[PDB]
């Protein structure tokens, strides 16, 4: 089973002159989008991003929607507030971000609670691990730190992260666990490409795997290469699955000395592959 997380990522973006700030809430269950609220619409509402959430009733949606609209307008003020703290123009576009949530163990219990803020892409404030105190990241933030102290919000948010957060996380995994546990194994193969002089390039591809977590290695006679092995970041196929490769420059004629390994969670055992010339 392993641990689990319920996380919300929120974005408030002012675009002065062009209308109201774009507001966005995305919810994740175990790093998997499952709800979204997007203010850019005539009647915005919270909405299911995974079919297993359609199991929840119009009552639930209404209630999350109303919360989100509240949060939206509150963040709208926060944007005007922040201009003040920072002595900034009322003309520029600015961004507030928030990441907050809870992760629990296999036993359903709270491993960790957190909430962190960022303005224009830099850390702003955060609830410390002790779920009771704040770390302000700069001087403007100290104003909020002291404001959130003089209003006891380190205790109010402590109830959420330990109570409703954890509880709903259990309700969520309940209906989504069969889909969440899904696994698509990588299919791998090695391509061969030229190179100036007496060198060639060997590329190990891994395609169609979920989730994105994967590991590729190259071996010269049983020993990982590290040094000057090239790779790309894991990237989406666009269809729910992922892609990675790793490549080595080897000597022409010495290709059969090299072995590629694919470690993924869906595999009965790591794949082992060789360049094979048809």
């Amino acid at each position: 089973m392993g641990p689990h997380s319920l996380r919300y990522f929120v974005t408030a973006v002012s675009r002065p002159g062009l209308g109201e700030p774009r507001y966005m809430e995305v919810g994740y269950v175990d790093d998997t989008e499952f709800v979204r609220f997007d203010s850019d619409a005539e009647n915005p509402r919270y909405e299911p991003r995974a079919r297993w959430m359609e199991q929840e009733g119009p009552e639930y949606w209404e209630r999350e929607t109303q919360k989100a609209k509240g949060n939206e307008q509150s963040f709208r003020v926060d944007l005007r507030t922040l201009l003040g703290y920072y002595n900034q123009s009322k003309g520029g576009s600015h961004t507030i971000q928030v990441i907050s949530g809870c992760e629990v163990g296999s036993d359903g219990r709270l491993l960790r609670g957190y909430q962190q803020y960022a303005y224009d892409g830099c850390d702003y404030i955060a609830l410390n691990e002790d779920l009771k105190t704040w770390t302000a990241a700069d001087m403007a933030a100290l104003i909020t730190k002291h404001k959130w102290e003089q209003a006891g919000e380190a205790e109010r948010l402590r109830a959420y992260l330990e109570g409703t957060c954890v509880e709903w996380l259990r309700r969520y995994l309940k209906n989504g666990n069969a889909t969440l546990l899904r696994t698509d194994s990588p299919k791998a193969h090695v391509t061969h490409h030229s190179r100036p002089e007496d060198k060639v390039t060997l590329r190990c591809w891994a395609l169609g795997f979920y989730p994105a977590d994967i590991t590729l290695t190259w071996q010269l006679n049983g020993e990982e290469l590290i040094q000057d092995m090239e790779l790309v970041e894991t990237r989406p196929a666009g269809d729910g699955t992922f892609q990675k490769w790793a490549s080595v420059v080897v000597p022409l004629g010495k290709e059969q000395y090299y072995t590629c390994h694919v470690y993924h969670q869906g595999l009965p055992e790591p794949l082992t592959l060789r360049w094979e010339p048809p």
Binding site: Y8, V10, E25, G27, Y46, Y60, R63, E64, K67, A68, G70, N71, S74, F75, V77, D78, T81, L82, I96, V98, S100, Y117, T144, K147, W148, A151, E153, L157, Y160, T164, C165, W168
Partner: peptide, 8 residues
């Protein structure tokens, strides 16, 4: 589900 965020 979601929390209400405090003003900054």
């Amino acid at each position: 589900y979601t929390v209400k965020y405090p003003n900054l």
